[PDB]
Design an enzyme around this catalytic site. Sequence first.
Site, PDB file in Angstrom:
ATOM      1  N   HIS A  40      41.347  39.650 -26.807  1.00 36.60           N
ATOM      2  CA  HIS A  40      39.477  39.508 -26.784  1.00 36.60           C
ATOM      3  C   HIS A  40      39.130  38.628 -25.627  1.00 36.60           C
ATOM      4  CE1 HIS A  40      40.255  35.538 -28.618  1.00 36.60           C
ATOM      5  NE2 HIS A  40      39.280  35.189 -28.020  1.00 36.60           N
ATOM      6  N   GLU A  52      46.307  23.627 -12.840  1.00 36.23           N
ATOM      7  CA  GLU A  52      44.871  22.927 -13.107  1.00 36.23           C
ATOM      8  C   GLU A  52      45.199  21.742 -14.212  1.00 36.23           C
ATOM      9  OE1 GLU A  52      42.355  23.131 -11.607  1.00 36.23           O
ATOM     10  OE2 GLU A  52      41.516  24.929 -11.350  1.00 36.23           O
ATOM     11  N   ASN A  54      41.761  18.896 -14.002  1.00 30.75           N
ATOM     12  CA  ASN A  54      40.418  18.954 -14.012  1.00 30.75           C
ATOM     13  C   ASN A  54      40.055  20.372 -13.578  1.00 30.75           C
ATOM     14  OD1 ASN A  54      37.729  18.768 -13.387  1.00 30.75           O
ATOM     15  ND2 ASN A  54      37.957  16.610 -13.533  1.00 30.75           N
ATOM     16  N   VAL A  57      37.501  20.274 -10.315  1.00 30.10           N
ATOM     17  CA  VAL A  57      37.749  19.274  -9.167  1.00 30.10           C
ATOM     18  C   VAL A  57      39.012  19.876  -8.551  1.00 30.10           C
ATOM     19  CG1 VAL A  57      38.467  16.995  -8.160  1.00 30.10           C
ATOM     20  CG2 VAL A  57      36.580  17.073 -10.065  1.00 30.10           C
ATOM     21  N   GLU A  62      46.659  22.988  -7.506  1.00 28.67           N
ATOM     22  CA  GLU A  62      46.127  24.472  -8.082  1.00 28.67           C
ATOM     23  C   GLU A  62      46.914  25.762  -7.482  1.00 28.67           C
ATOM     24  OE1 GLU A  62      44.174  21.925  -6.885  1.00 28.67           O
ATOM     25  OE2 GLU A  62      42.618  21.537  -8.461  1.00 28.67           O
ATOM     26  N   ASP A  84      46.000  40.990 -31.204  1.00 32.32           N
ATOM     27  CA  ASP A  84      45.188  40.291 -30.107  1.00 32.32           C
ATOM     28  C   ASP A  84      46.180  39.562 -28.848  1.00 32.32           C
ATOM     29  OD1 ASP A  84      42.963  39.204 -28.631  1.00 32.32           O
ATOM     30  OD2 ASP A  84      42.767  37.646 -30.098  1.00 32.32           O
ATOM     31  N   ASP A 171      41.525  21.113 -34.575  1.00 31.06           N
ATOM     32  CA  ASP A 171      41.464  22.871 -34.392  1.00 31.06           C
ATOM     33  C   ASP A 171      41.420  23.139 -32.958  1.00 31.06           C
ATOM     34  OD1 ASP A 171      41.941  25.316 -35.359  1.00 31.06           O
ATOM     35  OD2 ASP A 171      39.561  25.200 -36.122  1.00 31.06           O
ATOM     36  N   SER A 172      41.825  24.324 -32.645  1.00 29.84           N
ATOM     37  CA  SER A 172      41.289  24.771 -31.384  1.00 29.84           C
ATOM     38  C   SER A 172      39.805  25.630 -31.403  1.00 29.84           C
ATOM     39  CB  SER A 172      42.146  26.210 -31.113  1.00 29.84           C
ATOM     40  OG  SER A 172      42.060  27.213 -32.216  1.00 29.84           O
ATOM     41  N   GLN A 174      36.324  27.654 -29.261  1.00 29.23           N
ATOM     42  CA  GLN A 174      35.857  28.422 -28.179  1.00 29.23           C
ATOM     43  C   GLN A 174      36.120  27.778 -26.831  1.00 29.23           C
ATOM     44  OE1 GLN A 174      34.036  28.443 -31.257  1.00 29.23           O
ATOM     45  NE2 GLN A 174      34.387  30.627 -31.591  1.00 29.23           N
ATOM     46  N   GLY A 175      36.706  29.004 -25.988  1.00 29.06           N
ATOM     47  CA  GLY A 175      37.023  28.243 -24.770  1.00 29.06           C
ATOM     48  C   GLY A 175      38.679  28.226 -24.662  1.00 29.06           C
ATOM     49  N   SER A 177      40.542  29.963 -26.385  1.00 32.45           N
ATOM     50  CA  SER A 177      40.818  31.540 -26.776  1.00 32.45           C
ATOM     51  C   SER A 177      41.995  31.879 -25.748  1.00 32.45           C
ATOM     52  CB  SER A 177      39.696  32.343 -26.804  1.00 32.45           C
ATOM     53  OG  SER A 177      38.789  32.371 -27.525  1.00 32.45           O
ATOM     54  N   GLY A 178      43.100  32.621 -26.061  1.00 35.66           N
ATOM     55  CA  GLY A 178      43.863  33.079 -25.098  1.00 35.66           C
ATOM     56  C   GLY A 178      45.180  32.050 -24.814  1.00 35.66           C
TER      57      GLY A 178
HETATM   58  N1  LIG Z   1      39.160  27.370 -34.616  1.00 41.50           N
HETATM   59  C1  LIG Z   1      39.712  28.589 -34.088  1.00 41.50           C
HETATM   60  C2  LIG Z   1      39.181  29.628 -33.019  1.00 41.50           C
HETATM   61  C3  LIG Z   1      39.582  29.302 -31.976  1.00 41.50           C
HETATM   62  C4  LIG Z   1      39.223  30.113 -30.748  1.00 41.50           C
HETATM   63  C5  LIG Z   1      38.093  31.139 -31.213  1.00 41.50           C
HETATM   64  C6  LIG Z   1      37.507  30.922 -32.507  1.00 41.50           C
HETATM   65  C7  LIG Z   1      38.045  30.386 -33.559  1.00 41.50           C
HETATM   66 CA   LIG Z   2      41.470  21.363 -10.410  1.00 45.99          CA
END
Ligand SMILES: NCc1ccccc1
Ligand SMILES: [Ca+2]
Length: 223
Positions: A40, A52, A54, A57, A62, A84, A171-172, A174-175, A177-178
């Site tokens: 995704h 990486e 920061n 910066v 890097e 996924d 939790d994890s 948005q951002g 992801s992956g």
């Molecule tokens: N809280 C789980 C999650 C992580 C990344 C994107 C959507 C949901």
């Molecule tokens: Ca950096």
Amino acid sequence: IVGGYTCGANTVPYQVSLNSGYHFCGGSLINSQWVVSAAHCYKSGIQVRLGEDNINVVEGNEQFISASKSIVHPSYNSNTLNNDIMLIKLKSAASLNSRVASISLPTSCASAGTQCLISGWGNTKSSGTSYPDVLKCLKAPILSDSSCKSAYPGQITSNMFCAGYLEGGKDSCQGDSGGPVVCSGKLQGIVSWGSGCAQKNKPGVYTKVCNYVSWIKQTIASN
Ligand SMILES: NCc1ccccc1
Ligand SMILES: [Ca+2]
């Protein structure tokens, strides 16, 4: 990452940031020439950023390397998030040392109850929005198959597992992801989906990397 902690610069040397003008997803370095991320997270024009801490910066460790090829899993279904996973080949080999290193692929699947390390530059708020500059980390246990299925009835396939805290707060997000879920020094999961972040009874759902090791090995042997 919600409810986590600052990892420490370059302590997660396999973590990458995928950049298309801005950070948009994590990934994991598995070979000097290959990154594993979520399907995704697919887009054209990816630059892989290794070493990486920061992301806003230039700190001195890097390596920025453009992707030469992306390979989304043949059976990826974006509607269910089954399968996924995606491989990204680097235009040139990363230079491996302490601050940039590959993470091993698993041999065996991970066990329910194992405490894993999840990391990323994703949102740090359950309600609202705040994006960190330095890499954040969370220690989280793999949940039982039955608990995971109770949280998402009808939606958990054999290619997914849940990890985290049913009480919410950690939790994890948005951002993230992956990015990686590492358990006992092996890449066992990829940050994939859920329902929001750190909400009660809605833990994170992760791609079960052990089911993909044969596909990864064959793909890297032929591309
Ligand atoms: N809280 C789980 C999650 C992580 C990344 C994107 C959507 C949901
Ligand atoms: Ca950096």
